[PDB]
Amino acid sequence: GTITSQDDNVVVGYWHNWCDGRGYQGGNAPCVELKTVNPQYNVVNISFMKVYDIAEGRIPTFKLDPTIALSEAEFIAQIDTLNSQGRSVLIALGGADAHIELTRGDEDALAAEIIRLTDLYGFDGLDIDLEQAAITAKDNQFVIPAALKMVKEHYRKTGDNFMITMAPEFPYLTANGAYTPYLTELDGYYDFINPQFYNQGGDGLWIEGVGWIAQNNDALKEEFIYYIADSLINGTRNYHKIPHDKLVFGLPSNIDAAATGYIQDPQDLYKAFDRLKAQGQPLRGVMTWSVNWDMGTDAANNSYNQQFIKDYGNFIHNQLPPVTDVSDDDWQVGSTYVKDDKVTHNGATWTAQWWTKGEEPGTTGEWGVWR
Ligand code: NA
Numbered sequence: 001g002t003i004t005s006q007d008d009n010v011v012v013g014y015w016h017n018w019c020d021g022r023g024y025q026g027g028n029a030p031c032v033e034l035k036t037v038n039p040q041y042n043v044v045n046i047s048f049m050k051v052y053d054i055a056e057g058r059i060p061t062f063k064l065d066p067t068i069a070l071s072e073a074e075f076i077a078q079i080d081t082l083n084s085q086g087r088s089v090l091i092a093l094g095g096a097d098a099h100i101e102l103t104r105g106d107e108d109a110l111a112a113e114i115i116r117l118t119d120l121y122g123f124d125g126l127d128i129d130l131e132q133a134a135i136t137a138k139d140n141q142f143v144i145p146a147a148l149k150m151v152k153e154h155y156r157k158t159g160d161n162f163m164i165t166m167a168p169e170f171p172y173l174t175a176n177g178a179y180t181p182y183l184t185e186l187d188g189y190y191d192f193i194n195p196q197f198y199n200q201g202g203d204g205l206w207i208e209g210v211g212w213i214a215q216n217n218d219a220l221k222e223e224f225i226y227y228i229a230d231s232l233i234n235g236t237r238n239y240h241k242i243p244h245d246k247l248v249f250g251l252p253s254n255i256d257a258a259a260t261g262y263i264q265d266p267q268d269l270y271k272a273f274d275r276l277k278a279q280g281q282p283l284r285g286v287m288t289w290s291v292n293w294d295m296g297t298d299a300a301n302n303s304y305n306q307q308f309i310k311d312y313g314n315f316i317h318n319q320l321p322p323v324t325d326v327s328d329d330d331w332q333v334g335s336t337y338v339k340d341d342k343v344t345h346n347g348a349t350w351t352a353q354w355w356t357k358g359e360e361p362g363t364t365g366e367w368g369v370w371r
Contacts, residue, residue: 003160004083004124005191006043007324010248011309011316012165012194012287013041013294014092017048019067021292023256026299029292031068034078034089037291038306040313043088043165044291045127048095049117059109060100062091062117079122088124090163091117093144096131101138107146114151118162125163125191126151128182132169135178145185152189164190167250167287170215170228171203173240180240194248194287197228198261204228205237216260225249225263225272233281244281245322251286253308257293266311273315284324285316333358337369 019031037044049062064075079089091114094100102110117123126148134140148164155162164186172179173195183193197215204214205227213224227237229249235241249269252258263269269286276283288294294308321327331345334357341352343361350361350370361370 001080001122002083003118003155003162004086004088005161005163006088007326008042008321009316009319010043010192010285010287011040011313012043012045012248012250012285013037013291013309014045014047014287014289016290016292017046017062017065017068019065021296023293023296023299024259025256027254027256027293027297027304028301029256029290029296031065032292032295033068033070034075035081036295037082038294038309038313039085039087040309040317041087041291042317043090043163043287044082045090045092045129045165046121046123047092047290048098048129049091049093049126050095050098051100054099058102058106059113060093060098061113062121076121083122083124088163089122090125090127090165091121091123092127092129092167094128094130094134094167098131098134100130100134100140102140102143104139104142106139107143107150110143110147111150111154114147115154118151118155125161125165127165127167127194129167135172141181141185145182148186149189161191165248166190166193166195168193168195169200170195170197171200173232173242174238175235175240177240183240183242190246192246192248192284193242194250195232195242196250196261196289197225198250198252198258198289201260205231205239207237218264221263221265221268222272225269226275229272229276229283230279230281233276233283244276244283245324247283248285248287249283251288251308253288253290253293254296254298254304256296256298256304257289263311266315269312270315273319277319282319282322284322285319286312288312331361333360 021029168179231237231239233244331343337352345361356369
Protein backbone atom coordinates (compact mmCIF):
# COMPACT_ATOMS: atom_id res chain seq x y z
CA GLY A 1 0.00 0.00 0.00
CA THR A 2 2.87 2.40 0.80
CA ILE A 3 6.04 2.81 -1.25
CA THR A 4 8.83 2.99 1.32
CA SER A 5 12.14 4.13 -0.16
CA GLN A 6 15.64 4.07 1.41
CA ASP A 7 17.46 7.43 1.40
CA ASP A 8 20.25 6.28 3.74
CA ASN A 9 22.97 3.59 3.76
CA VAL A 10 21.75 0.07 2.98
CA VAL A 11 22.32 -3.45 4.09
CA VAL A 12 20.61 -5.50 1.39
CA GLY A 13 19.61 -9.12 1.74
CA TYR A 14 18.04 -11.53 -0.76
CA TRP A 15 15.06 -13.65 0.44
CA HIS A 16 14.44 -17.11 -1.10
CA ASN A 17 10.95 -17.86 -2.45
CA TRP A 18 11.77 -21.55 -1.90
CA CYS A 19 12.72 -23.93 0.94
CA ASP A 20 15.84 -26.05 1.51
CA GLY A 21 18.22 -24.56 -1.05
CA ARG A 22 21.43 -26.60 -1.25
CA GLY A 23 24.77 -24.91 -0.61
CA TYR A 24 28.07 -24.86 -2.49
CA GLN A 25 29.67 -26.79 0.41
CA GLY A 26 26.68 -29.05 0.96
CA GLY A 27 24.78 -26.84 3.46
CA ASN A 28 21.06 -25.94 3.67
CA ALA A 29 19.21 -22.62 3.40
CA PRO A 30 15.66 -23.02 4.80
CA CYS A 31 12.68 -20.85 3.82
CA VAL A 32 12.05 -18.18 6.50
CA GLU A 33 9.16 -15.85 7.10
CA LEU A 34 9.80 -12.22 6.21
CA LYS A 35 9.15 -10.96 9.75
CA THR A 36 11.94 -13.31 10.95
CA VAL A 37 14.58 -11.43 8.87
CA ASN A 38 17.12 -9.53 10.94
CA PRO A 39 15.93 -5.90 11.23
CA GLN A 40 19.32 -4.58 10.16
CA TYR A 41 18.42 -5.89 6.69
CA ASN A 42 16.79 -2.56 5.61
CA VAL A 43 16.28 -3.72 1.99
CA VAL A 44 14.93 -7.22 1.46
CA ASN A 45 14.85 -8.56 -2.08
CA ILE A 46 12.10 -11.18 -2.77
CA SER A 47 13.67 -13.77 -5.11
CA PHE A 48 12.45 -14.18 -7.85
CA MET A 49 10.08 -12.67 -10.38
CA LYS A 50 10.47 -15.09 -13.30
CA VAL A 51 8.62 -17.11 -15.94
CA TYR A 52 7.46 -20.08 -13.88
CA ASP A 53 5.81 -21.67 -16.95
CA ILE A 54 6.51 -20.64 -20.53
CA ALA A 55 2.92 -21.58 -21.49
CA GLU A 56 1.89 -18.44 -19.55
CA GLY A 57 4.00 -16.58 -22.19
CA ARG A 58 7.09 -14.32 -21.99
CA ILE A 59 6.12 -11.85 -19.16
CA PRO A 60 7.72 -12.94 -15.79
CA THR A 61 5.55 -12.92 -12.69
CA PHE A 62 5.72 -13.66 -8.97
CA LYS A 63 3.93 -16.47 -7.12
CA LEU A 64 4.55 -16.99 -3.40
CA ASP A 65 5.82 -20.57 -2.90
CA PRO A 66 3.15 -22.70 -1.06
CA THR A 67 5.81 -24.64 0.87
CA ILE A 68 6.77 -21.54 2.90
CA ALA A 69 3.44 -22.12 4.61
CA LEU A 70 2.38 -18.48 4.45
CA SER A 71 -0.89 -17.25 3.00
CA GLU A 72 -0.74 -14.38 0.55
CA ALA A 73 -2.54 -12.05 2.99
CA GLU A 74 0.02 -13.01 5.70
CA PHE A 75 3.04 -12.29 3.45
CA ILE A 76 1.50 -8.92 2.48
CA ALA A 77 0.99 -8.26 6.22
CA GLN A 78 4.73 -8.87 6.85
CA ILE A 79 5.71 -6.49 4.03
CA ASP A 80 3.45 -3.89 5.69
CA THR A 81 5.33 -4.49 8.96
CA LEU A 82 8.68 -4.06 7.31
CA ASN A 83 7.42 -0.87 5.70
CA SER A 84 6.27 0.35 9.18
CA GLN A 85 9.90 -0.07 10.38
CA GLY A 86 11.04 2.01 7.40
CA ARG A 87 12.54 -1.01 5.59
CA SER A 88 12.14 -1.73 1.84
CA VAL A 89 11.02 -4.94 0.12
CA LEU A 90 12.07 -5.16 -3.53
CA ILE A 91 11.07 -7.71 -6.13
CA ALA A 92 14.17 -9.21 -7.70
CA LEU A 93 13.80 -9.83 -11.41
CA GLY A 94 15.77 -12.76 -12.75
CA GLY A 95 17.82 -15.41 -11.02
CA ALA A 96 18.96 -18.79 -12.33
CA ASP A 97 16.64 -20.54 -14.85
CA ALA A 98 14.23 -17.49 -14.95
CA HIS A 99 13.49 -18.00 -18.74
CA ILE A 100 13.37 -14.22 -19.30
CA GLU A 101 13.60 -13.72 -23.08
CA LEU A 102 11.55 -10.64 -23.96
CA THR A 103 10.85 -9.36 -27.46
CA ARG A 104 10.36 -5.72 -28.52
CA GLY A 105 6.79 -4.74 -27.67
CA ASP A 106 6.78 -6.73 -24.40
CA GLU A 107 7.68 -3.68 -22.28
CA ASP A 108 4.06 -2.47 -21.93
CA ALA A 109 2.92 -5.83 -20.47
CA LEU A 110 6.07 -6.17 -18.35
CA ALA A 111 5.48 -2.73 -16.81
CA ALA A 112 1.76 -3.60 -16.26
CA GLU A 113 2.74 -6.78 -14.39
CA ILE A 114 5.42 -4.86 -12.37
CA ILE A 115 2.71 -2.40 -11.31
CA ARG A 116 0.04 -5.07 -10.58
CA LEU A 117 2.41 -6.98 -8.29
CA THR A 118 3.63 -3.77 -6.68
CA ASP A 119 0.15 -2.54 -5.80
CA LEU A 120 -0.86 -6.05 -4.67
CA TYR A 121 2.10 -6.99 -2.36
CA GLY A 122 3.33 -3.51 -1.56
CA PHE A 123 6.80 -3.89 -3.08
CA ASP A 124 8.97 -0.80 -2.85
CA GLY A 125 10.73 -1.43 -6.17
CA LEU A 126 12.69 -3.87 -8.27
CA ASP A 127 16.15 -5.42 -8.40
CA ILE A 128 17.41 -6.35 -11.88
CA ASP A 129 19.22 -9.58 -11.15
CA LEU A 130 19.51 -11.33 -14.48
CA GLU A 131 21.35 -14.62 -14.96
CA GLN A 132 24.25 -14.50 -17.39
CA ALA A 133 22.24 -16.06 -20.24
CA ALA A 134 19.56 -13.31 -20.02
CA ILE A 135 21.91 -10.25 -20.07
CA THR A 136 21.76 -10.05 -23.90
CA ALA A 137 19.03 -12.58 -24.59
CA LYS A 138 16.50 -11.53 -27.24
CA ASP A 139 15.60 -7.84 -26.65
CA ASN A 140 16.06 -7.85 -22.79
CA GLN A 141 18.54 -4.91 -23.07
CA PHE A 142 15.75 -2.80 -24.66
CA VAL A 143 12.58 -4.17 -22.99
CA ILE A 144 13.68 -4.25 -19.39
CA PRO A 145 14.87 -0.57 -19.24
CA ALA A 146 11.86 0.59 -21.32
CA ALA A 147 9.47 -1.14 -18.92
CA LEU A 148 11.26 0.10 -15.77
CA LYS A 149 11.24 3.73 -17.02
CA MET A 150 7.46 3.55 -17.48
CA VAL A 151 7.14 2.03 -13.95
CA LYS A 152 9.38 4.73 -12.39
CA GLU A 153 7.39 7.50 -14.15
CA HIS A 154 4.06 5.95 -13.08
CA TYR A 155 5.04 6.17 -9.39
CA ARG A 156 6.81 9.56 -9.64
CA LYS A 157 3.47 10.96 -10.87
CA THR A 158 1.91 9.80 -7.58
CA GLY A 159 4.55 11.07 -5.14
CA ASP A 160 6.67 7.94 -4.88
CA ASN A 161 10.24 6.71 -5.43
CA PHE A 162 9.80 3.20 -6.86
CA MET A 163 13.31 1.88 -6.23
CA ILE A 164 15.40 0.45 -9.06
CA THR A 165 18.51 -1.49 -8.11
CA MET A 166 20.67 -3.95 -10.11
CA ALA A 167 22.86 -7.00 -9.30
CA PRO A 168 25.32 -7.29 -12.24
CA GLU A 169 28.12 -9.84 -11.93
CA PHE A 170 31.15 -7.47 -11.73
CA PRO A 171 33.08 -8.63 -14.90
CA TYR A 172 30.12 -7.33 -17.05
CA LEU A 173 30.84 -3.79 -15.71
CA THR A 174 33.83 -2.97 -17.92
CA ALA A 175 33.42 0.16 -20.00
CA ASN A 176 31.11 -0.75 -22.90
CA GLY A 177 30.45 -4.14 -21.17
CA ALA A 178 27.34 -6.28 -21.66
CA TYR A 179 25.66 -4.78 -18.59
CA THR A 180 26.35 -1.16 -19.46
CA PRO A 181 23.16 -0.53 -21.60
CA TYR A 182 21.10 -1.27 -18.46
CA LEU A 183 23.16 1.36 -16.59
CA THR A 184 23.06 4.10 -19.25
CA GLU A 185 19.37 3.56 -20.17
CA LEU A 186 18.39 3.71 -16.47
CA ASP A 187 20.80 6.47 -15.42
CA GLY A 188 18.74 8.87 -13.24
CA TYR A 189 16.15 6.13 -12.71
CA TYR A 190 18.27 3.74 -10.69
CA ASP A 191 18.80 4.22 -6.92
CA PHE A 192 21.92 2.08 -6.46
CA ILE A 193 23.73 -0.86 -7.98
CA ASN A 194 24.77 -3.82 -5.89
CA PRO A 195 27.10 -5.87 -8.02
CA GLN A 196 27.90 -9.47 -7.20
CA PHE A 197 31.62 -9.62 -6.21
CA TYR A 198 31.38 -13.47 -5.98
CA ASN A 199 31.09 -16.55 -8.25
CA GLN A 200 33.64 -15.15 -10.72
CA GLY A 201 36.77 -17.15 -9.85
CA GLY A 202 40.02 -15.58 -11.05
CA ASP A 203 38.25 -12.58 -12.59
CA GLY A 204 39.66 -9.40 -11.07
CA LEU A 205 41.82 -6.41 -12.03
CA TRP A 206 45.49 -5.69 -12.46
CA ILE A 207 47.06 -3.00 -10.22
CA GLU A 208 50.72 -1.88 -10.57
CA GLY A 209 52.77 -2.48 -7.38
CA VAL A 210 50.35 -5.27 -6.45
CA GLY A 211 49.79 -7.62 -9.39
CA TRP A 212 46.67 -9.45 -10.50
CA ILE A 213 44.02 -9.12 -7.83
CA ALA A 214 41.54 -11.92 -8.24
CA GLN A 215 38.04 -12.15 -6.68
CA ASN A 216 38.90 -15.58 -5.21
CA ASN A 217 42.16 -14.33 -3.62
CA ASP A 218 41.46 -14.33 0.13
CA ALA A 219 44.95 -13.06 0.91
CA LEU A 220 44.41 -9.84 -1.05
CA LYS A 221 40.80 -9.27 -0.05
CA GLU A 222 41.29 -5.63 1.17
CA GLU A 223 43.11 -4.71 -2.07
CA PHE A 224 40.38 -6.38 -4.16
CA ILE A 225 37.48 -4.58 -2.46
CA TYR A 226 39.29 -1.22 -2.46
CA TYR A 227 40.57 -1.22 -6.05
CA ILE A 228 37.50 -2.78 -7.72
CA ALA A 229 35.29 -0.16 -5.96
CA ASP A 230 37.72 2.73 -6.64
CA SER A 231 37.68 1.73 -10.39
CA LEU A 232 33.81 1.71 -10.50
CA ILE A 233 33.31 4.97 -8.60
CA ASN A 234 35.85 6.80 -10.82
CA GLY A 235 35.13 5.01 -14.10
CA THR A 236 38.83 4.08 -14.25
CA ARG A 237 40.91 0.97 -15.12
CA ASN A 238 38.35 0.17 -17.90
CA TYR A 239 35.30 0.02 -15.58
CA HIS A 240 31.98 1.77 -16.23
CA LYS A 241 31.29 4.54 -13.74
CA ILE A 242 28.83 3.79 -10.88
CA PRO A 243 29.05 6.69 -8.33
CA HIS A 244 29.96 5.70 -4.75
CA ASP A 245 26.59 7.03 -3.56
CA LYS A 246 24.89 4.45 -5.86
CA LEU A 247 27.39 1.60 -5.20
CA VAL A 248 26.72 -1.18 -2.71
CA PHE A 249 29.22 -4.10 -2.39
CA GLY A 250 27.54 -7.49 -2.97
CA LEU A 251 28.94 -10.45 -1.12
CA PRO A 252 28.17 -14.08 -0.17
CA SER A 253 26.81 -14.65 3.38
CA ASN A 254 29.05 -17.64 3.83
CA ILE A 255 30.94 -20.33 1.94
CA ASP A 256 27.61 -22.14 1.27
CA ALA A 257 26.05 -19.02 -0.35
CA ALA A 258 28.53 -18.92 -3.28
CA ALA A 259 31.49 -20.77 -4.83
CA THR A 260 33.92 -17.88 -4.13
CA GLY A 261 33.91 -14.28 -2.82
CA TYR A 262 33.12 -14.82 0.90
CA ILE A 263 35.08 -12.39 3.07
CA GLN A 264 37.01 -14.43 5.66
CA ASP A 265 38.27 -11.36 7.59
CA PRO A 266 35.68 -8.51 7.89
CA GLN A 267 38.58 -6.19 8.83
CA ASP A 268 39.44 -6.43 5.09
CA LEU A 269 36.06 -4.77 4.29
CA TYR A 270 36.20 -2.15 7.13
CA LYS A 271 39.63 -1.05 6.03
CA ALA A 272 38.69 -0.80 2.36
CA PHE A 273 35.47 1.13 3.12
CA ASP A 274 37.44 3.51 5.37
CA ARG A 275 39.98 4.22 2.57
CA LEU A 276 37.06 4.91 0.19
CA LYS A 277 35.48 7.20 2.86
CA ALA A 278 38.81 8.99 3.45
CA GLN A 279 39.06 9.75 -0.30
CA GLY A 280 35.68 11.42 -0.24
CA GLN A 281 33.85 8.57 -2.01
CA PRO A 282 32.24 6.36 0.72
CA LEU A 283 30.11 3.42 -0.49
CA ARG A 284 26.36 3.22 0.04
CA GLY A 285 26.46 -0.15 1.88
CA VAL A 286 26.73 -3.93 1.40
CA MET A 287 24.46 -6.59 -0.08
CA THR A 288 24.34 -10.34 0.47
CA TRP A 289 23.14 -13.54 -1.01
CA SER A 290 21.36 -14.16 1.26
CA VAL A 291 19.29 -13.73 4.40
CA ASN A 292 18.33 -17.43 4.06
CA TRP A 293 22.00 -18.49 3.92
CA ASP A 294 22.79 -16.14 6.86
CA MET A 295 20.15 -18.14 8.85
CA GLY A 296 21.04 -21.45 7.26
CA THR A 297 23.11 -24.53 8.02
CA ASP A 298 26.42 -26.07 7.03
CA ALA A 299 26.77 -29.65 5.91
CA ALA A 300 27.16 -30.86 9.49
CA ASN A 301 23.92 -29.01 10.43
CA ASN A 302 25.76 -26.24 12.30
CA SER A 303 23.91 -22.90 12.12
CA TYR A 304 25.71 -20.02 10.36
CA ASN A 305 24.10 -18.04 13.18
CA GLN A 306 23.58 -14.74 11.36
CA GLN A 307 27.32 -14.05 11.12
CA PHE A 308 27.11 -11.76 8.04
CA ILE A 309 24.62 -9.39 9.63
CA LYS A 310 26.72 -9.58 12.82
CA ASP A 311 29.81 -8.59 10.85
CA TYR A 312 28.35 -5.76 8.68
CA GLY A 313 25.04 -4.57 10.20
CA ASN A 314 26.31 -2.13 12.81
CA PHE A 315 29.40 -1.20 10.65
CA ILE A 316 27.25 0.12 7.79
CA HIS A 317 24.34 1.58 9.83
CA ASN A 318 26.93 3.50 11.98
CA GLN A 319 28.16 5.20 8.78
CA LEU A 320 27.36 8.88 8.10
CA PRO A 321 24.26 9.28 5.86
CA PRO A 322 24.97 9.51 2.09
CA VAL A 323 24.06 12.46 -0.13
CA THR A 324 20.62 10.86 -0.69
CA ASP A 325 19.52 11.54 2.87
CA VAL A 326 16.70 13.82 4.07
CA SER A 327 17.99 15.67 7.16
CA ASP A 328 15.10 17.44 8.97
CA ASP A 329 16.15 19.40 12.06
CA ASP A 330 13.89 19.60 15.13
CA TRP A 331 11.53 22.55 15.35
CA GLN A 332 12.80 25.47 17.44
CA VAL A 333 10.81 28.30 19.07
CA GLY A 334 13.29 31.13 18.34
CA SER A 335 13.83 30.11 14.68
CA THR A 336 12.27 31.90 11.69
CA TYR A 337 11.15 29.41 9.04
CA VAL A 338 9.85 30.15 5.50
CA LYS A 339 7.63 28.52 2.81
CA ASP A 340 8.75 24.86 2.35
CA ASP A 341 11.03 24.70 5.42
CA LYS A 342 10.49 21.22 6.89
CA VAL A 343 11.34 20.45 10.55
CA THR A 344 10.79 17.42 12.79
CA HIS A 345 8.50 17.70 15.85
CA ASN A 346 6.65 15.17 18.07
CA GLY A 347 7.87 12.34 15.78
CA ALA A 348 6.43 13.81 12.57
CA THR A 349 7.57 16.08 9.74
CA TRP A 350 5.87 19.47 9.34
CA THR A 351 6.23 21.75 6.29
CA ALA A 352 6.12 25.56 6.74
CA GLN A 353 3.54 27.18 4.42
CA TRP A 354 4.81 30.74 5.02
CA TRP A 355 6.75 32.99 7.45
CA THR A 356 6.66 31.78 11.05
CA LYS A 357 8.54 31.99 14.37
CA GLY A 358 7.71 30.72 17.88
CA GLU A 359 4.72 28.74 16.51
CA GLU A 360 4.90 25.08 17.51
CA PRO A 361 3.90 22.48 14.87
CA GLY A 362 0.71 20.84 16.18
CA THR A 363 -0.76 23.87 17.99
CA THR A 364 -1.15 25.86 14.77
CA GLY A 365 -4.64 24.55 13.92
CA GLU A 366 -5.56 22.90 10.61
CA TRP A 367 -4.83 25.90 8.31
CA GLY A 368 -1.98 27.61 10.21
CA VAL A 369 1.65 27.77 9.04
CA TRP A 370 2.59 24.13 9.87
CA ARG A 371 1.07 21.41 7.70
NA1 NA B 1 5.64 -0.91 0.13
